[PDB]
Symmetry: C2
Subunit: 652 residues, 2 copies
């Protein structure tokens, strides 16, 4: 159809206008240059004028458009201006255009066209030929880009002068077109081959044939009085060379520029007719995919404040629900609870027994007054554990906002981080101050009419999993330990499908060993052996934290750490009961009161604040530059692609 | 002894100088005037010159001192100046002196003396005679003052003219001297009695005799050419009247001015000799009693700052120990504890059960969310009970300082009250603010990993005594109830020695009745009868406070107040356990945490403050006018009394 070839030209010109043209699935001829070639002569001959850059140069993907005319001349798309009448100017222009967008390559197409009553109607797409190599590698990926397309035909150009078993043209062609679905194949410089190198078989198409087939041509090196080559001498010479050759006189009808021109035409046309429909579909599909992002744009215009207000309503309001949310969902939900119900370990840790406790009794002696000295100094030691807890909350919390501050804008996310992240720092002080008071309270009264007794009265929940290298089996690899609040067990693979053993949490106690690895062990209070024939189970971990975290996640399982167990014997006899009674109750309080406090201040202060005072603060006081490029690319893709199909017509 | 009579004169003159002279135990003649008299003539005759105020007038206690001389004249103590030579001037002076210190009386003595070769050596103390009566009553108390003294002799002067069975002189004398230890008795105006009224027996001393005896005299009304009476005509007339009388001619040696003068002399002298020793002792004793107050004065001089510094060290430093002291000793020691361990009642009171509790469950329905609604609203109701407690502490505390702010100075005590009393007002705010926070904390978290269970888990100390009118026995008086934390019993008299009954605190519950008397009762949960045959024991009290206080002092004894006791039955089934579990623990906290808090703030704030910041505040920013009078009286008593004994000599 006379409108088939001319049609695809409109696409390229329009799409090429914005340069994203490898990507569009477009039916076109993909000239591939291999080795010495030269592919360019094969082009300059179709017109009868040498315009392509002289020498190897093979510049950038260049879209050549041979549109049959009555007069010889050409004009590029960038100028949109003059019509070149001096083909020598083209060369000068093309080369200039190249360096502007670049030794340098670029997939951006030139998209040139040429009106001439000499050139047969064809559009030839020319790509940089092979060489002989970083440049080369760089080169090849883009070439792969083009041939790889479903609907791109490669006119693999191979010089007969050399071995064809290894031709840059066909070689690369076999990669993207193992058959002859698109590859055609051209044979140049028969004259180069040595007195005997002639190989008709290949034009015969053997070793190996393309569905498209092979064609032969010879570029006359003859020069006119002018520098530019003359058409007849070259043309007539072809029909001469062939007809005056034994193994080619019978192929001459099919050998030469004249045939190749005709071939490429009715071959490129038989392509557009079958494929155009696929294009319509594959083109209309990539359109909606864009409209699915334009609907997100809301108003397709810049810029409206109403949109900013909507952002404030959603950008800064969903973040409110994004929080209670994150808090209650390890995630912040239990990373959080953990610290409240693991905290009691920090207490036990920063507390004492045995002789340290006993020495204090001796100091008190040298009963009620003694009790005050003991506790008033013990409760004083609760500051250490308490203060640490507060800080622990901030960590998992201050970083929590960040776990949902990415879900884009550089101005807004950073602002949100500064406004919230700092607020907690202001309150970490407030709360920490409230903590001291609560403690100082104890050193003030310590009633005994409490539930405690008066002096002289006597006398399936899986706690945590993880790996933990066992220790010193001498015959020592780690295992997937999954201690629960009911029974500890360690398996082999995180799969947990090969249970190694199961120790009864009952009658177990944890004690540190030595103290450059952080090692701790577990021993049974009843059975001389913990597990198997081992006196104690020694578990090693990488850092002190892992230990602290594990032991904390152990007491909650019932595995307390292990504490050894004149008339001074009767004296401390009662005292022992005293310290225990009160300390026991005072502990129950804090382990409950501390968590409660924070929730009011750290949590509620923040929750409340971020809920409404945040937006107000934002009122009181974008790109995505990278993303902005896409929208410009997006905004341009639409305006371009619409013309693509608005021109294709409708099922022709 | 010639120095006996003249001695006591020096005392009076010196002591009289400062007027406190009824009080000093001094040997002297106490002239008492009764009825018509006139006692004064009896005085003017001893000298032979009428100087005493003319007429009845009998002015003020007047100390007359008849010191034998060679020339006639006199001089008072106030003037210290001229020697009166014109006896008419005395009268003018005496009367003037009287009005200055007064119709008006005053125990302040005049202390007059008179040198004359006519007057026999005597010192006569003259007091206002009786009249015929508010003035009179007023008069008598001062007279009693004088006669009452151990060593004061009353020359009861009775006019024979009238009945002696009723004589103001002797009558009043019999009151302070039932015998004749000091009363002497003089008889004047024999001539007044009717032709037969003569009564020798009494001079005979019968009806009745004084150890001292009686004496008779008659005042000549005769007038010289001058107004003043003449001596011979009067004197000679006496020896005449008597010697020329049957029942008196034999008494004439003992009748008349001449004898009375002699009598009074050697009678007043025989007094001073025996008594002076007693005076020395009774005078030296009242001296040291003064020195026991001068040693308290420290430096006997005004004024030194060092003393003020010492006051600051002790006046404002002992008050520090005066406090911990008062706090731990009803007194502040338990008035205090009481409020901390009775407070839990206020909670129970300002809390609810039955349908009020049930209605809330229905609102929650229309489980975890319901639990929050219940508690978050229940803990909210704890503000009421809590706030009241704080105020209760202030009362017993703010008034405590006053319980030891009296132990004198007007400037200092008031300053102390203002400085401390106000400080608490400043802190009652601070603490009250700390209370709200603690509560608001609860409405923030309410962990359930506490010791409570998860949802769906199920499905001799004498507390106080006092009176209390029982109610409506119909046959209703009060009894001395002495409920303990082991057994309640009511007795009859605060003596507690007639126990009426003894109810087992076990199985008892208190419920209010009706609700213009505040009545409440007690009923046994097991036995249909509380005590005796009564269904319930009804105790009435005067004010709501007594009730609130009693019920509070009852729960602590185990006698709680009494609380009645579609598939909604299974729904609230679990909820019931929920509310109870958490509420139970949250209560244990406050009943302990509230007391602890205050001790830190109210108590320790104050204890600390008053201990050191008080004195500093005092630095940063007396009489006892009444007391000042005593010191002036004290300072003068010494300077006077010292001369008293420094003159008496030593055991003469």
């Amino acid at each position: 159809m006379e409108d088939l070839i001319p049609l695809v030209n409109r696409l390229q010109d329009a799409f090429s206008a914005i340069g994203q043209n490898a990507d569009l699935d477009l039916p076109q001829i993909a000239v591939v240059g291999g080795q010495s070639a030269g592919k360019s002569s094969v082009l300059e001959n179709f017109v009868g004028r040498d315009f392509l850059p002289r020498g190897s140069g093979t510049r950038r993907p260049l879209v050549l458009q041979l549109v049959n005319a009555t007069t010889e001349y050409a004009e590029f798309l960038h100028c949109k201006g003059k019509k070149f009448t001096d083909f020598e100017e083209v060369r000068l222009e093309i080369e200039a255009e190249t360096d502007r967008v670049t030794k340098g390559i670029s997939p951006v197409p030139i998209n040139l066209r040429v009106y001439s009553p000499h050139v047969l109607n064809l559009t030839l797409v020319d790509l940089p030929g092979m060489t002989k190599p970083d440049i080369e590698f760089q080169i090849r990926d883009m070439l792969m880009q083009f041939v790889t397309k479903e609907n791109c035909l490669i006119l693999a150009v191979s010089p007969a002068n050399s071995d064809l078993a290894n031709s840059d043209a066909l070689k690369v062609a076999k990669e993207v077109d193992p058959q002859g679905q698109r590859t055609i194949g051209v044979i140049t410089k028969l004259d180069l081959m040595d007195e005997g190198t002639d190989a008709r078989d290949v034009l015969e198409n053997k070793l190996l044939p393309l569905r498209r087939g092979y064609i032969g041509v010879v570029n006359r090196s003859q020069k006119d009085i002018d520098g530019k080559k003359d058409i007849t001498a070259a043309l007539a010479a072809e029909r001469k060379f062939f007809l005056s050759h034994p193994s080619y006189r019978h192929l001459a009808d099919r050998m030469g520029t004249p045939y190749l021109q005709k071939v490429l035409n009715q071959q490129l046309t038989n392509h557009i007719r079958d494929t155009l429909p696929g294009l319509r579909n594959k083109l209309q599909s990539q359109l909606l995919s864009i409209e699915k992002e334009v609907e997100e744009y809301k108003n397709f215009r810049p810029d409206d404040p109403a949109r900013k207000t909507k952002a404030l309503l959603q950008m800064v309001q969903q973040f409110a629900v994004d929080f209670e949310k994150r808090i209650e969902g390890s995630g912040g939900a239990r990373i959080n609870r953990i610290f409240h119900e693991r905290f009691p370990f920090e207490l036990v840790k920063m507390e004492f027994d045995e002789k340290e406790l006993r020495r204090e009794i001796s100091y008190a002696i040298k009963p009620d007054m003694a009790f005050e000295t003991i506790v008033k100094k013990q409760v004083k030691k609760i500051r250490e554990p308490c203060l640490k807890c507060v800080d622990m909350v901030i960590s998992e919390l201050i970083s929590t906002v960040r776990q949902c501050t990415k879900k884009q804008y550089p101005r807004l996310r950073e602002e949100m981080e500064r406004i919230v992240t700092t607020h907690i720092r202001e309150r970490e002080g407030r709360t920490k101050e409230q903590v001291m008071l609560l403690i100082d309270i104890e050193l003030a009264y310590m009633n005994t009419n409490h539930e405690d007794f008066i002096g002289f009265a006597n006398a399936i929940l899986v706690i945590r999993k993880g790996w933990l290298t066992i220790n010193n089996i001498g015959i020592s690899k780690e295992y997937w330990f999954v201690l629960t609040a009911e029974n500890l067990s360690w398996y082999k693979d995180d799969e947990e499908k090969e249970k190694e053993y199961m120790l009864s949490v009952d009658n177990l106690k944890l004690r540190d060993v030595e103290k450059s690895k952080h090692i701790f062990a577990l021993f049974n209070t009843e059975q001389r052996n913990v597990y198997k024939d081992y006196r104690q189970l020694e578990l090693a971990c990488e850092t002190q934290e892992e230990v602290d975290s594990w032991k904390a996640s152990f007491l909650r399982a019932g595995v307390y750490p292990e504490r050894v167990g004149p008339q001074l014997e009767r004296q401390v006899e009662t005292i022992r009961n005293l310290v225990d009674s009160y300390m026991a109750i005072v502990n129950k309080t804090v382990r409950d009161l501390m968590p409660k406090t924070i929730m009011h201040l750290m949590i509620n202060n923040t929750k409340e604040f971020i809920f409404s005072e945040l937006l107000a603060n934002l009122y009181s006081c974008e790109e995505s530059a990278e993303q902005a490029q896409r929208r410009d690319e997006m905004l341009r893709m639409y305006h371009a692609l619409k013309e693509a199909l608005s021109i294709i017509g409708d099922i022709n």
